[PDB]
RNA sequence: AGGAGGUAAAAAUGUAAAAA
RNA sequence: CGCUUACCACUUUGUGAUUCAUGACUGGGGCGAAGUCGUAACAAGGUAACCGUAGGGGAACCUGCGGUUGGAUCACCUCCU
RNA sequence: CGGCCGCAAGGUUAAAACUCAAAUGAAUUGACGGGGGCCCGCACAAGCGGUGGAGCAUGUGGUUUAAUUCGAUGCAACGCG
RNA sequence: CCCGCAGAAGAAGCACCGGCUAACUCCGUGCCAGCAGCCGCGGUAAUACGGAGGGUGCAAGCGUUAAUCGGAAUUACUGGG
């Protein structure tokens, strides 16, 4: 019902390095406007939903579950900062989706036409000794 | 017909398919026996059949039938298997020998007790 | 990063041996998912939103109290997605 | 009684609303 | 006796043949019908059907060409002699 | 699948696993046919007056109720028992 | 192997009973639980599920499984289309 964004201030490690690709001398030098976060598995906010992120095979997440997302879209670092915070809630909150199994099924009116069908063959099979 | 055709190509003996490919000329076989579940029979009948999936000694995963009320198998317990189809659940063609290593006899079978492997109550 | 808290026991119209409860529409969960809640056609939900819950298999009173409430929150999480 | 012509138009399904 | 030479087995290398296991995924089949879509075929099945071939199409199938009968149907109204 | 042939479509040769207790032919009694022939009925046509729209009486379904007794509930139940 | 003691003492179960295939009723469960080589039995009277009584077969053996030939003139030379 009630749900509110948490994003533990400080619990999420944030690093900053230079970008890739082409783009003059502003992308190889002071291009440290690019991010690369670190969300260890030791964080554990929900605790039990947490173990489902770890055993969950996926990219942008190592074997130890450090969760590393390298943001590279624009020059502004505050843009990739929010662009990353969005890719986390897009990865994290996309795996929270605990789809319902809710099974199985069962015949409702099979016996209402099948059983009457056989009962109609059970009466025809009387051809034998008089 | 027409003998010359016959001397070139003789009368073909129909190589019949053996109904139970557990192991040819083999009366019984044992298995690890896993997967105990229940599925529905076909159009004529209407019930819930207790079946099992056995890993054979020669390595053949086949499904068998536990004939009787007595359920004495859970994901393990090695049992004995004999041939016999039940024809209602398509896919199964073997009977679990009731009175095996870990499969005991069914209770209150005071008539026809050789089958279901129950010994005689002296009283 | 999106702390979940589905707090039950609030604006309820739980009527009832085997429960037949309703759910009030004029409150609980706002317009973005409320319209998603008011746009479901499965004939369990009426044309108002006073949803006619017909939970009858969970025999006992207090059990069907929460089971129909379970029928409520399950229908809610499906329609709040 | 032989004979030749012409005379005609679209329309499914049989759990079919009753379960989760 | 030692040594030497020819031959052969194990071992070795390279390259083929065949067979048997296995392989993400993928093709089609059988079976389970208790669902969804349509109703193609069986009456002239509501466009006769089927066969081969080519193209088309969510599905049965549709269409062109040629072929087979394993297809039904001859009621009446005008008129000559 | 392999071989064979082919510009390609594909053709020819020809499996098995698995699955079912059936599938098939001719003919018979029926039944049905938006098959044909013939015939009848307030079936249609030619007419007249009604129901359905309104109010009320009465029966039923649904709903409600502590109970609203039960059964009938296409034609052939519903001013029925 | 023979003589002697010898209290019946110490010595009978198994399958099946709807038809095929010799042999029947009652009770409990209700297309549920289950049976079966084949057709199939079972929705509150189950001659077929379980049990009980009685019956039939065979016997220190009796069943079930597996396998071969037979039935199968369903590889037909004898003996087919």
Taking a C-beta distance cutoff of 8 angstroms, is the pair A6, A45 a contact? yes
DSSP percent split of chain C into helix, strand, coil, nearest 5: 30, 5, 60
Edge to edge, the sheet with strand B29-31 lists: B29-31, B79-83, B94-96, B61-65, B49-55, B34-39
Is the shortest CB-to-strand distance from A109 to strand D under 7 Å?
A: yes
CA of B94 and C1' of G14: distance in angstroms?
A: 24
Choose among A1, A89, A100: nearest Cβ to C2: A89
Report yes or no on chains B and C touching (3+ CB pairs under 8 A). no
Where does residue B88 rank: exposed (0-12), middle (13-18), buried (19+ CB within 10 A)? middle
Which chains have 3 or more CB–CB distances shorter than 8 Å to chain A?
B, C
Strand D: which bases are under 7 Å from protein Cβ? Answer: 15, 17-20
Is the shortest CB-to-strand distance from B98 to strand F under 7 Å?
A: no
Q: Which residues of A touch B44 (CB under 8 A)?
A: 118
C-alpha atoms less than 13 angstroms from C-alpha of B12 in its C-beta half-sphere: 6
Q: What is the DSSP letter of A24?
A: G
Name the CATH code of domain B1-123 (choices 2.40.30.10, 3.40.190.10, 3.40.50.450, 2.40.50.140).
Answer: 2.40.50.140
Distance CA A49, CA A43 (A): 12
| DSSP E strand boundaries for B1-123 | 29-31, 34-39, 49-55, 61-65, 79-83, 94-96
Is the shortest CB-to-strand distance from C21 to strand D under 7 Å?
A: no
Domain ranges of chain B: 1-123
Contact C2 A97 (CB under 8 A): no
C41 inside 8 A of chain A by CB: no
Distance CA B117, CA A36 (A): 70
Q: What is the DSSP letter of B56?
A: B
Distance CA B86, CA B44 (A): 13
Taking a C-beta distance cutoff of 8 angstroms, is the pair B32, B78 a contact? yes
Distance CA B74, CA B94 (A): 18
CA of A124 and C1' of F23: distance in angstroms?
A: 21
């Amino acid at each position: 019902i009630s749900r509110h964004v948490a994003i533990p201030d400080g619990e999420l490690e944030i690093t900053a390095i230079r970008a890739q690709g082409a783009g003059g001398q502003h992308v190889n030098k002071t291009s440290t406007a690019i991010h690369l976060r670190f969300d260890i598995r030791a964080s554990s906010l929900p605790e039990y939903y947490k173990e489902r992120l770890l055993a969950a095979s996926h990219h942008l997440i190592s074997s130890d579950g450090v969760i590393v997302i390298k943001a590279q879209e624009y020059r502004s670092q505050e843009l990739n900062r929010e662009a990353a915070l969005a890719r986390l809630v897009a990865m994290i909150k996309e795996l929270t989706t605990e789809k319902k199994a809710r099974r199985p099924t069962r015949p409702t009116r099979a016996s209402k036409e099948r059983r009457l069908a056989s009962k109609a063959q059970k009466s025809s099979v009387k051809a034998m000794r008089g | 017909a027409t003998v010359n055709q016959l001397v070139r190509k003789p009368r073909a003996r129909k190589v019949a398919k053996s109904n139970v490919p557990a192991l040819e000329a083999c009366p019984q076989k044992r298995g690890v026996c896993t997967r105990v579940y229940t599925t529905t029979p076909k159009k004529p009948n209407s019930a819930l059949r207790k079946v099992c999936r056995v890993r054979l000694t020669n390595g053949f995963e086949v499904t068998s039938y536990i004939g009787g009320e007595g359920h004495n198998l859970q994901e393990h317990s090695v049992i004995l298997i004999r041939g016999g189809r039940v024809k209602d659940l398509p896919g199964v063609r073997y009977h679990t020998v009731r009175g095996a290593l870990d499969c005991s006899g069914v209770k209150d079978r005071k008539q026809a007790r050789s089958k279901y492997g129950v010994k005689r109550p002296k009283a």
